[PDB]
């Protein structure tokens, strides 16, 4: 998150922190995700497409910090890693960038809701907020584009939804953005998602209910003028989500 503010997991208690174990045993952060039911976390396929093997991953819930334990957190293996079969990418734009992780602790349990661990509602189909609506984004990604390190403490910020029309203009993204994606940015371009935020939630309050409107997917640079963040538009994937989770 470029700009924004520090936070803790109580303020985003569906947020899941996803890590990968390496051949020789070191563990590194991959991406964010969101708890949509006790046994299911939703994230972005590009985060997993190089290492598609479920045994490689660890998922935490109720974690506020990148490299230390938060009291109350829960740790899970990935029982199934489900990537979208229509995924595609060109160096920039990912299409169908959506993934499901079925989670299971070493005790064979799913998430148990607590003060730090809660689910986030999915949107109704094809039901998104008006462009110009402010929404929130959360993650442990870079705080500056040139940074070498990720922040140790979780961050959040606020960005405004931008119309497909504005985002499709050649000085924005042209044809790279489709109607299965949502753009969102700050009006000053001073805050945005960045590397390491992918997979995480774009949450918007749709008539009082906090809703997973988007999943961080891509963008050119971070907080760069005329280059919004681009998010998977969750309300266009409900059948996919319902099928793969009912599983």
């Amino acid at each position: 998150i470029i700009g924004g503010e520090f936070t803790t997991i109580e303020n985003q208690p569906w947020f899941a922190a996803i890590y990968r174990r390496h051949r020789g045993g070191s563990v590194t952060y991959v991406c964010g995700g969101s708890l949509i039911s006790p046994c299911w976390v939703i994230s972005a396929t590009h985060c997993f497409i190089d290492y598609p093997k479920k045994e490689d991953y660890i998922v935490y819930l109720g974690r506020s910090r990148l490299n230390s334990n938060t009291q109350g957190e829960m740790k899970f293996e990935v029982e199934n890693l489900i990537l979208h079969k229509d995924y595609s990418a060109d160096t920039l734009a990912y299409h169908n960038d959506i993934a499901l992780l079925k989670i299971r602790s070493k005790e064979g349990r799913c998430a148990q809701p607590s003060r730090t661990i809660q689910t986030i509602a999915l949107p109704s189909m094809y039901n998104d907020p008006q462009f110009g609506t402010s929404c929130e984004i959360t993650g442990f990604g870079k705080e500056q584009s040139t940074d070498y390190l990720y922040p140790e403490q979780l961050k959040m910020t606020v960005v405004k939804l931008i119309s497909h029309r504005e985002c499709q203009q050649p000085h924005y993204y042209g044809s790279e953005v489709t109607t299965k994606m949502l753009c969102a940015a700050d009006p000053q371009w001073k805050t945005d998602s960045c590397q390491g935020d992918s997979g995480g939630p774009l949450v918007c309050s749709l008539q009082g209910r906090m809703t997973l409107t988007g999943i961080v997917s891509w963008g050119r640079g971070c907080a760069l003028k005329d280059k919004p963040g681009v998010y998977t538009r969750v309300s266009h994937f409900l059948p996919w989500i319902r099928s793969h989770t009912k599983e």
Binding site: T91, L92, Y94, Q195, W218, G219, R220, G221, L224, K227
Partner: peptide, 10 residues
């Protein structure tokens, strides 16, 4: 220039 997700403009 081109052109990666995430990092720099170029």
């Amino acid at each position: 220039c081109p052109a990666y997700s995430x990092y720099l403009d170029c």
